[PDB]
């Protein structure tokens, strides 16, 4: 039933669908209808995809950014398997041919008709790529583990597809009548009003008269800008404050509606509380109409006037110094700005990637200048992905510019889209209207790729407790669900597990304050062994990675950390995956995990860029996902311990040492006996170099032995990222105990130590080359509202850390000084 689906979406998204109809908002109604049709169209296209196309949608390939290898292969409808010896250069089709020839000798009598599933995972090996190019095979080679694959026939893939079915005349200056206000404060009240195009003012800010603290103004506010000169994306901003400075509230609105009509007349603005004008703030009123301060205003009836159509704009827009023009196109003076504007046609024809610089010099408060800009923009060639990411920033608020950025971003591969999905979702917070190119783009890509769909859902769902986005995000999630009824049910199962984990964690938090850890753990186990818990916590796709299946919860191995937020440690097992089904998740409630996730995704991007230059620093890109209000999951890295635990140098252990400095190296030796130690020290050195560079570039502070971990392989990694971008200028950090392992336990080992400095330098030089990408991504991230990523000073931190202004030689000299200063600071 359609009524059951509506109740299922309401429970899933955390907002009743009946709440959308109650708003009596035509913009909400049109978004709902239009996006339902768009998403149902994508669903219709999906149900008819060929079986290889269904594989690409549901299990997109996980590829890396000669030698012999053993692979265990079984068929779907059999327990029997065969261990084959293939090459790392061999294609999956060669492996499938071997599997079918071996099955032919057993059963006594087409590789193209199969795909190779990774046992116990929603992950497949298919296509013309050597086995070593697959992330699963690559991971198996580094750990020494044998790949375990399953031959799945095309009929079985199709069975999965089927089961998962669904104007220029108005020259008068702009003016408003400020009628009256509302709510309490301590003084007189002043309403400051500003007209903006993004962060930049269209005219000077004008204030109304001071009135003592239900205020009544009934005052005319006039602005130094003509009505015909108002850009399409013009934003009228307000700030209500008190004076003898005491900020009270703020409110913004678009001067044109979603249907391009210039707004008239009376508007009641339900204001948002403050920390004075906030141009980047939402243009939708505070939904808490009971307690919110309100500001009533009147927009004069200029008569029904709409913003001129594109055909009209283009018609109006249609109507040796080259040396200095080139040098400035690599903050600028007023004469330089006029040079760019005068030679705008030459920018289009010979310097198209300088469009951003041209957009920042155009006079957005003059409609003739805008029409001239838009005429060039509509015939402007498509720009690279890097250029388009810059154009998504609030510094480029025009709708045609926004539509241009999206058009250039259609060439993003699913892998690049996934890499930047977090920032693209944050850009939605800068959006002026509900129906927009970015939402249509995100919804389209999400419905064409199940992994993208999963993370788009969770990035939106985890922000539903935030009033300023709840409406927009709820509507996008409802639209998505219309596009995939099956994935909606898959996501509901995840939500049911998270609901139980929250309830379980609340119980643990209460119990842990009354009794011992063994007693709370046994009580946690008793709660989990209840049928409702056993059922809800088992057989789901991990919110951290939909390719990871969490089969049977292993209650005996579940525990909690008897500190701070009392996070839970949840273990799983799967007979179908064998040792690969043994995975864990950490559930944590009480901390905002958004910065933790951003820090880990930024380190993961560093790893990708390094690998693209053939540099593998053996990083540990474990998952971290916010799922709700101060709630999230962390992927467990098994076979790892904290540096602090190892450094405790406990007795009757294989790691016990004569000197504390040897505990870490002895731990490594105990986990890597004989010939394996060399490989382990190498893994430690590489990862130590990656994390030294990463923590330095990102300004990660408060680093101690309790928030640094080591894998049994030797790979070092970081946990509990509470602080970044120097928010307590953090120096480069070298630790003597780590230098000691690098130096193979020798006091003097310049050969090993300088190989390590070489790793650090190469890692650093690579990131500098992609410096602009980090700046563009962090600029989009400002939209998230993270307190450590609020201003220009936070972005300036990356510029200084990557030394972007300097030359490669100057930067490397400067980095070498910071490394030497850290080496001297290390005892
Ligand atoms: C019970 C529990 C609930 S949350 C939690 C976290 C951790 C560690 C700190 N973090 C991580 N571990 C693995 N993968 C990760 N991605 C993280 C993270 N982030 C441990 C833990 C693990 C091993 C060794 C010790 C040291 N102990 C013996 C003194 C602690 C732990 O036991 N728990």
UniProtKB/Swiss-Prot annotation:
EC number annotated for this UniProt entry: 2.7.1.137, 2.7.1.153
Stretches for region G-loop: 560-566
Tissue: Abundantly expressed in adult mouse spleen as well as in testis. Isoform 1 is expressed in spleen and lung (at protein level). Isoform 1 is expressed predominantly in leukocytes.
Outcome following mutation: residue 720 to A: Inhibits lipid kinase activity. Mice are viable and fertile but display defective adaptive and innate immune responses Signaling defects in B-cells, T-cells, mast cells and natural killer cells. Reduced B and T-cell receptor signaling
Alphabetized UniProt keyword annotations: Adaptive immunity, ATP-binding, Chemotaxis, Cytoplasm, Differentiation, Immunity, Inflammatory response, Innate immunity, Kinase, Lipid metabolism, Nucleotide-binding, Phosphoprotein, Transferase
Boundaries of every PI3K-RBD domain copy: 66-153
A GO BP annotation: B cell activation
Subcellular location: Cytoplasm
Listed GO CC annotations: cytosol
A GO molecular function held by the record: 1-phosphatidylinositol-3-kinase activity
C2 PI3K-type domain location: 170-300
PIK helical domain: residues covered: 318-483
Disruption phenotype: Null mutants are viable and fertile but display defective adaptive and innate immune responses due to signaling defects in multiple cell types including B-, T- and mast and natural killer cells.
Pfam families tied to this protein: PI3_PI4_kinase, PI3K_C2, PI3K_p85B, PI3K_rbd, PI3Ka
Activity control, per UniProt: Activated by growth factors and cytokine receptors through a tyrosine-kinase-dependent mechanism. Activated by RAS. IC87114 inhibits lipid kinase activity and is selective in cells at doses up to 5-10 uM. Among other effects, IC87114 reduces allergic responses, prevents the recruitment of antigen-specific T cells into target tissue, and affects natural killer cell chemotaxis.
Modified residues (Phosphotyrosine): 333
Pathways per UniProt: Phospholipid metabolism; phosphatidylinositol phosphate biosynthesis
Key word Ribonucleoprotein present: no
Domain (PI3K/PI4K catalytic) ranges: 554-827
Leading EC class: transferase
Region (Activation loop): 718-735
Oligomer status and interactors: Heterodimer of a catalytic subunit PIK3CD and a p85 regulatory subunit (PIK3R1, PIK3R2 or PIK3R3). Interacts with ERAS and HRAS.
Family: Belongs to the PI3/PI4-kinase family.
Protein name listed in UniProt: Phosphatidylinositol 4,5-bisphosphate 3-kinase catalytic subunit delta isoform
Protein source organism: Mus musculus
């Amino acid at each position: 039933v359609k009524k059951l689906i509506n109740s299922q979406i309401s429970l899933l998204i955390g907002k009743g669908l009946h709440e959308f109809d109650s708003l009596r908002d035509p913009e909400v109604n049109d978004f709902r209808t239009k996006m339902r049709q768009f998403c149902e169209e994508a669903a219709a296209h999906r149900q008819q995809l060929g079986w290889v196309e269904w594989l690409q949608y549901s299990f997109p390939l996980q590829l890396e950014p000669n030698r012999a290898l053993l692979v265990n292969v079984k068929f779907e409808g059999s327990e029997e398997s065969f261990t084959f010896q293939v090459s790392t250069k061999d294609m999956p089709l060669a492996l499938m041919a071997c599997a079918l020839r071996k099955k032919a000798t057993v059963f006594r009598q087409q590789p193209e008709e199969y795909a190779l599933q990774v046992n116990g995972r929603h992950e497949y090996l298919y296509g013309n790529y050597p086995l070593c190019h697959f992330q699963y095979i690559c991971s198996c080679l580094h750990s020494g583990l044998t790949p375990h694959l399953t031959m799945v026939h095309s009929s079985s893939i199709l069975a999965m597809r089927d089961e998962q079915s669904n104007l220029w005349s108005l020259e008068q200056p702009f003016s408003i009548e400020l009628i009256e206000g509302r709510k309490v404060n301590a003084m007189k009240l002043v309403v400051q009003a500003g007209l903006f195009h993004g962060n930049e003012m269209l005219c000077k800010t004008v204030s109304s008269s001071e009135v003592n603290v239900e205020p009544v103004w009934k005052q005319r506010l006039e602005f130094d800008i003509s009505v015909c000169d108002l850009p399409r994306m013009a934003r009228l901003c307000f700030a209500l404050y008190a004076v003898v400075d005491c900020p009270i509230a703020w409110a913004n609105l678009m001067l044109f509606d979603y249907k391009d009509q210039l707004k008239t007349g009376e508007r009641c603005l339900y204001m948002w509380p403050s920390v004075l004008l906030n141009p980047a703030g939402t243009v939708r009123g505070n939904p808490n109409t009971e307690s919110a301060a309100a500001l009533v205003i009147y927009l004069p009836e200029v008569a029904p006037v709409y913003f001129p159509a594109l055909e009209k704009i283009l018609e109006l827009g249609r109507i040796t110094e080259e040396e200095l023009r080139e040098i400035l196109e690599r903050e600028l003076y007023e004469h330089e700005k006029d040079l760019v504007w005068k030679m705008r046609h030459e920018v289009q024809e010979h310097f198209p990637e300088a469009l951003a610089r041209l957009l920042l010099v155009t006079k957005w408060n003059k409609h003739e200048d805008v029409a001239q800009m838009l005429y060039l923009l509509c015939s402007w060639p498509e720009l690279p992905v890097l250029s388009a990411l810059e154009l998504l920033d609030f510094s480029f608020p025009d709708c045609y510019v926004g539509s241009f950025a999206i058009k250039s971003l259609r060439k993003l591969t699913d892998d690049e889209l996934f890499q930047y999905l977090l920032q693209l979702v944050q850009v939605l917070k800068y959006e002026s209207y509900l129906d927009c190119e970015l939402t249509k783009f995100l919804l389209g890509r999400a419905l064409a790729n199940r992994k993208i769909g999963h993370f788009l859902f969770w990035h939106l769902r985890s922000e539903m407790h935030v009033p300023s986005v709840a409406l927009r995000f709820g509507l996008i999630m409802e639209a998505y669900c219309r596009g995939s009824t099956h994935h909606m049910k898959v996501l509901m199962k995840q939500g049911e597990a998270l609901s139980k984990l929250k309830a379980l964690n609340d119980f643990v938090k209460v119990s842990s304050q009354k009794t011992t850890k063994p007693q709370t753990k046994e009580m946690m186990h008793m709660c989990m062994r209840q049928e409702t818990y056993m059922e809800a916590l088992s057989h789901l796709q991990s919110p951290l990675d939909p390719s990871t299946l969490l089969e049977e919860v292993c209650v005996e191995q579940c525990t909690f950390m008897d500190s701070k937020m009392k996070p839970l440690w949840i273990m799983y097992s799967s007979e179908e995956a064998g040792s690969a089904g043994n995975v864990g998740i950490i559930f944590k409630n009480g901390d905002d995990l958004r910065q933790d996730m951003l820090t880990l995704q930024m380190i993961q991007l560093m790893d990708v860029l390094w690998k693209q230059e053939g540099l593998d620093l053996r990083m540990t890109p474990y998952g971290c996902l916010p799922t709700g209000d101060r709630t999230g999951l962390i992927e467990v890295v098994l076979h790892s311990d904290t540096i602090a635990n190892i450094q405790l140098n406990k007795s009757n252990m294989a790691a016990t040492a004569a000197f504390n400095k040897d505990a870490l190296l002895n731990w490594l030796k105990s986990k890597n006996p004989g010939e394996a130690l060399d490989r382990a020290i190498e893994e430690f050195t590489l990862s130590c170099a990656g994390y030294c560079v990463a923590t330095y570039v990102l300004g990660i502070g408060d680093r101690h032995s309790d928030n640094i971990m080591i894998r049994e392989s030797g790979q070092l990694f970081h946990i509990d990222f509470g602080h970044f971008l120097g928010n307590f200028r953090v120096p480069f950090i070298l630790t003597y105990d780590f230098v000691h392992v690098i130096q193979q336990g020798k006091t003097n080992n310049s050969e090993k130590f300088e190989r390590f400095r070489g790793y650090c330098e190469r890692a650093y030089t690579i990131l500098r080359r992609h410096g602009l990408l980090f700046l563009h991504l962090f600029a989009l991230m400002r939209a998230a509202g993270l307190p450590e990523l609020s201003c220009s000073k936070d972005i300036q931190y990356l510029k200084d850390s990557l030394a972007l202004g300097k030359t490669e030689e100057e930067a490397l000299k400067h980095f070498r000084v910071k490394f030497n200063e850290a080496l001297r600071e290390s005892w």
